[PDB]
mmCIF file of C-alpha atoms in Angstrom:
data_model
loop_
_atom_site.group_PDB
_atom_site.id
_atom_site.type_symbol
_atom_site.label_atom_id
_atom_site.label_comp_id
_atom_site.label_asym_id
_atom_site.label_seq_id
_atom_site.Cartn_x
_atom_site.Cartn_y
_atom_site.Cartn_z
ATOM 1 C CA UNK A 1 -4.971 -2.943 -30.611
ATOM 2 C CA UNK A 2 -3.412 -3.403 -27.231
ATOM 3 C CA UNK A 3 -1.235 -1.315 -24.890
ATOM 4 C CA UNK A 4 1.370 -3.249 -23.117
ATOM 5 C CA UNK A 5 2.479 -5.597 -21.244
ATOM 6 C CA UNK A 6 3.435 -3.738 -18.424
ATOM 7 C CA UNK A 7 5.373 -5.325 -15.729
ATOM 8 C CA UNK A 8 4.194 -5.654 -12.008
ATOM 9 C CA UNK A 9 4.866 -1.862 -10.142
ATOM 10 C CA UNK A 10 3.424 0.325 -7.960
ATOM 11 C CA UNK A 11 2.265 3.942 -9.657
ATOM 12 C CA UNK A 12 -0.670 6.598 -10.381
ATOM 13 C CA UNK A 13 -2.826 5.550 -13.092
ATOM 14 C CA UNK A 14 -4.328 8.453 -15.531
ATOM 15 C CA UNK A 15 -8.115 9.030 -15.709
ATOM 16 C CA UNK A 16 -10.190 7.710 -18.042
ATOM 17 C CA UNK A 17 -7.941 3.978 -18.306
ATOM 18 C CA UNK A 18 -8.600 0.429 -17.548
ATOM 19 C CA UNK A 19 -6.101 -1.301 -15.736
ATOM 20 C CA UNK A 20 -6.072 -4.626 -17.455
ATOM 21 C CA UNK A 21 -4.449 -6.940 -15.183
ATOM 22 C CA UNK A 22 -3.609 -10.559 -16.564
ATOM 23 C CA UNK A 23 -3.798 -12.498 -13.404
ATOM 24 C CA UNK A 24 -1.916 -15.757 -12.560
ATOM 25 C CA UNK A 25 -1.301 -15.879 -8.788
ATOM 26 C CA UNK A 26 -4.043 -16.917 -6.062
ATOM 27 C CA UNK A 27 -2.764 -14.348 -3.415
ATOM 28 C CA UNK A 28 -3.454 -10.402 -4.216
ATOM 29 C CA UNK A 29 -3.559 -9.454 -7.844
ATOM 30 C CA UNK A 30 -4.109 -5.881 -7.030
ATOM 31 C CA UNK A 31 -4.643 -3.165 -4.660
ATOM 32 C CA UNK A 32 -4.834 0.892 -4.757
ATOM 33 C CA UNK A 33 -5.197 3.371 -1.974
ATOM 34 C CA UNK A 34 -5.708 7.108 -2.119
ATOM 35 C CA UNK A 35 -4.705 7.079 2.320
ATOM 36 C CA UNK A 36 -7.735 9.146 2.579
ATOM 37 C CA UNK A 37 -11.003 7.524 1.577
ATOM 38 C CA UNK A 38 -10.506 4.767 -0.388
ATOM 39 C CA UNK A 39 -8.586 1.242 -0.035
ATOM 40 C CA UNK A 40 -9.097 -1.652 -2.155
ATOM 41 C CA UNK A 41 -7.522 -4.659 -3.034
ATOM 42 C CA UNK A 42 -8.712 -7.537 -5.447
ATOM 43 C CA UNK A 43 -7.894 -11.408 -4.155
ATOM 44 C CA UNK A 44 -7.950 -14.633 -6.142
ATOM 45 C CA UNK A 45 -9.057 -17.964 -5.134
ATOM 46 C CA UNK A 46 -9.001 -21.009 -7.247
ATOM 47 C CA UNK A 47 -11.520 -23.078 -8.581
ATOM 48 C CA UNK A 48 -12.883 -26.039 -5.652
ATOM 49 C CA UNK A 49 -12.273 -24.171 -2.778
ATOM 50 C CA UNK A 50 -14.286 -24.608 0.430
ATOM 51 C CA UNK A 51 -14.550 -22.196 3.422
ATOM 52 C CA UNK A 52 -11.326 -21.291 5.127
ATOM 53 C CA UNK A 53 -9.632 -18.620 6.002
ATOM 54 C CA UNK A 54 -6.421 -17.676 4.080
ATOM 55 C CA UNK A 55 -3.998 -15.187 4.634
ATOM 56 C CA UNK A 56 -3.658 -12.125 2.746
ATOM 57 C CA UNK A 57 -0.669 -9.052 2.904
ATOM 58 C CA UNK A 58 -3.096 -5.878 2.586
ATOM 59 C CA UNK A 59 -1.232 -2.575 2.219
ATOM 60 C CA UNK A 60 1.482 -3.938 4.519
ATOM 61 C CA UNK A 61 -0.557 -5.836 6.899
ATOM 62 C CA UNK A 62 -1.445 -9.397 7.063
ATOM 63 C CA UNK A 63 -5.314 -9.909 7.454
ATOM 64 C CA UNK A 64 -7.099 -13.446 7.620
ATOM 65 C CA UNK A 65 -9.944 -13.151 5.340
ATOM 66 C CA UNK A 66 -12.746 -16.497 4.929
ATOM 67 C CA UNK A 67 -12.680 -17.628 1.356
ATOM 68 C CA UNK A 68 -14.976 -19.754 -0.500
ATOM 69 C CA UNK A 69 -14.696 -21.281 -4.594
ATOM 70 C CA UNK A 70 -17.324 -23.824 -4.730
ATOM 71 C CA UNK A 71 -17.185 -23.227 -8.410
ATOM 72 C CA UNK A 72 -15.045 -24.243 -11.514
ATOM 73 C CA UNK A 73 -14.118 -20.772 -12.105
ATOM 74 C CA UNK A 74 -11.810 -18.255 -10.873
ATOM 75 C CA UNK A 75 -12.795 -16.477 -7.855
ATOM 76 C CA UNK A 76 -11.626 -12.386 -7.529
ATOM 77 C CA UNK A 77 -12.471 -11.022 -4.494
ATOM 78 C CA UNK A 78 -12.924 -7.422 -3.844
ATOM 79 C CA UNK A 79 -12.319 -5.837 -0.516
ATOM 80 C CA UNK A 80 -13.191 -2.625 0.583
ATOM 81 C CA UNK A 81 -12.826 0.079 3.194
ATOM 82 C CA UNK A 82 -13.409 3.862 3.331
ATOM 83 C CA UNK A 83 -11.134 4.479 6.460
ATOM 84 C CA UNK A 84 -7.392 4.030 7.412
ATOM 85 C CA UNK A 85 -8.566 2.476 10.954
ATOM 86 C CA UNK A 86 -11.918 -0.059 9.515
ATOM 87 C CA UNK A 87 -11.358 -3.488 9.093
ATOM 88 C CA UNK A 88 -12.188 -4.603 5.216
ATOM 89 C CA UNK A 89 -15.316 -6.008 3.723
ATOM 90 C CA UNK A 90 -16.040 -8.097 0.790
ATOM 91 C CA UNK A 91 -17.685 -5.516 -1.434
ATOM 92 C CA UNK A 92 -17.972 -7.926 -4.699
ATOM 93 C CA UNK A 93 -17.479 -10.965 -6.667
ATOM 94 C CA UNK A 94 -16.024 -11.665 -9.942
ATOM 95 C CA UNK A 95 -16.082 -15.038 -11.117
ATOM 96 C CA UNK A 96 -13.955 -15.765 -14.282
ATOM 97 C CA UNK A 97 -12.532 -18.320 -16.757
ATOM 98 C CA UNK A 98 -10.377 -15.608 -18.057
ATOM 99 C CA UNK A 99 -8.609 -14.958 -15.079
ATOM 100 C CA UNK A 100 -8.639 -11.174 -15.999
ATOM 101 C CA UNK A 101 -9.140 -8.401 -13.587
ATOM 102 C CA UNK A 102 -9.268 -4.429 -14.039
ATOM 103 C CA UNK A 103 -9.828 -1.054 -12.522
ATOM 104 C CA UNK A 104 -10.856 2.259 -13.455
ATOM 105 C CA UNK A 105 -10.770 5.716 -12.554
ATOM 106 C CA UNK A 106 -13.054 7.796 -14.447
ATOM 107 C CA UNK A 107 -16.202 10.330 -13.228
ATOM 108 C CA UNK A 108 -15.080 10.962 -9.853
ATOM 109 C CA UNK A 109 -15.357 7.450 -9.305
ATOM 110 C CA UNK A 110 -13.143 3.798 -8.995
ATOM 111 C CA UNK A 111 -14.539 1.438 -11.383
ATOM 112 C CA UNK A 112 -13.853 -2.553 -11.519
ATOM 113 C CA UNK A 113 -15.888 -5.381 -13.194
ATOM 114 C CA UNK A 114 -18.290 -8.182 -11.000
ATOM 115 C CA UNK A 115 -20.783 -10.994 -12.291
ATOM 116 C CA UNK A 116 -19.577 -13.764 -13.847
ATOM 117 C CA UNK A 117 -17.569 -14.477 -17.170
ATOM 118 C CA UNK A 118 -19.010 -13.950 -19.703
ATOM 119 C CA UNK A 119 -21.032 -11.422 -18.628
ATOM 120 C CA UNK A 120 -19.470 -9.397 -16.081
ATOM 121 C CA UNK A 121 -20.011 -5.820 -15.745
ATOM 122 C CA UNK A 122 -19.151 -2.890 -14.199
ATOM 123 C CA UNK A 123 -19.574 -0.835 -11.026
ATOM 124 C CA UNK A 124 -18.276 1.910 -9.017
ATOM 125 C CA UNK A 125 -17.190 2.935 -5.374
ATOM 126 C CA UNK A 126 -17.080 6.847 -4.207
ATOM 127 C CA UNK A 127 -14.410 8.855 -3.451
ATOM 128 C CA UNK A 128 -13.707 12.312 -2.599
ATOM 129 C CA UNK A 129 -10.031 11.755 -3.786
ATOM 130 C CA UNK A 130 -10.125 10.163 -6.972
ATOM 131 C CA UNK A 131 -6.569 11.510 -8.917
ATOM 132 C CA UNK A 132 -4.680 10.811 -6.006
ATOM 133 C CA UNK A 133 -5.207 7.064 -5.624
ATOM 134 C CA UNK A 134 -2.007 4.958 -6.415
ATOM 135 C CA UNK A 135 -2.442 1.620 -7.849
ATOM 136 C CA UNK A 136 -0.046 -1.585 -7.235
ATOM 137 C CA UNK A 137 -0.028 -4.484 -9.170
ATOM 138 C CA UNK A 138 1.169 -8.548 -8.694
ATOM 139 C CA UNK A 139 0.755 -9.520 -12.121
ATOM 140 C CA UNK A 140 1.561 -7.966 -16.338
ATOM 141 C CA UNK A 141 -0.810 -5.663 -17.118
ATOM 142 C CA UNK A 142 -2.442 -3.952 -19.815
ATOM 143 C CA UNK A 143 -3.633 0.075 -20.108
ATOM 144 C CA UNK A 144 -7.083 0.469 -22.072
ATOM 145 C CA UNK A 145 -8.942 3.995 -23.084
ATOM 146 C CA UNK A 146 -12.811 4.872 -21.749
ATOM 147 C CA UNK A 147 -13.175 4.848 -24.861
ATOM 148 C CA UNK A 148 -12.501 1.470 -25.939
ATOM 149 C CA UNK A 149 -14.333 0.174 -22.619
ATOM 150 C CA UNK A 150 -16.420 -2.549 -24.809
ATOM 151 C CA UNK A 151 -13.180 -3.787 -25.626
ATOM 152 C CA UNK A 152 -11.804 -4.324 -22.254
ATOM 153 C CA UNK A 153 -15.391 -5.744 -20.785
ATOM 154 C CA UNK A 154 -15.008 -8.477 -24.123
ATOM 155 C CA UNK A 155 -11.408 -9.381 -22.466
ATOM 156 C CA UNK A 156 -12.872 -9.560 -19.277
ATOM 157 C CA UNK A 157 -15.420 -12.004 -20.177
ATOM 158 C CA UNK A 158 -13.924 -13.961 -23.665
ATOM 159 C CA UNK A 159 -9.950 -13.511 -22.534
ATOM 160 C CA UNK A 160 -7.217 -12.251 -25.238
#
């Protein structure tokens, strides 16, 4: 039924596989780069949060991003940037009582989930580099085929 646990570790994930991270920390639960066009890294914030900044270790740099969890739920943050010398932007939201995060490489594109549990779906950023992005993660994971995606979107939104 399900592939895993994997321990936390840095490494190239195959197409066509979600990345089924089970999340725990509030600091950076994941991030993947390809060093060409594509850098992404997904933060957590806890529930009752309001606006501050907190600081984050991004790719080996500290950043100071503003955070805010009005909610009762999990916050996952994504950030984004397409160039080694940009500053990053919060591309989307995830908000979660599962506390469950993943990525995907699949169609020439990076795939993660946004909305809010339990009915968060997913959506893609470009790349011109896909194969070559390396993935690192903070937290036990879990690998999940394309072709069981419905699976992996019920454990994003119901939990295991």
């Amino acid at each position: 039924v399900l592939d895993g646990p994997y321990q936390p570790v840095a490494f190239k994930p195959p197409n066509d596989y979600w990345i089924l991270v089970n999340s725990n920390s509030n600091g950076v639960v994941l991030e993947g780069t390809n060093n060409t066009d594509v850098w992404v890294a997904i933060i957590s914030i806890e529930p009752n949060v309001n606006s501050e900044s907190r600081q984050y270790s991004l790719f080996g740099v500290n950043k100071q991003i503003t955070v805010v969890n009005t909610s009762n739920k999990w916050k996952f943050m994504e950030m984004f940037r397409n160039n080694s010398n940009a500053e990053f932007q919060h591309k989307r939201t995830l908000t979660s009582s599962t506390k469950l995060v993943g990525i995907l490489k699949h169609g020439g594109r990076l795939w993660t989930y946004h909305g809010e549990t339990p009915n968060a779906t997913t959506d893609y950023s470009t790349t011109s580099n896909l194969n070559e992005i390396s993935v690192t993660t903070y937290a036990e994971f879990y690998i999940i085929p394309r072709s069981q995606e419905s699976k992996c979107t019920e454990y994003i939104n119901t939990g295991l």
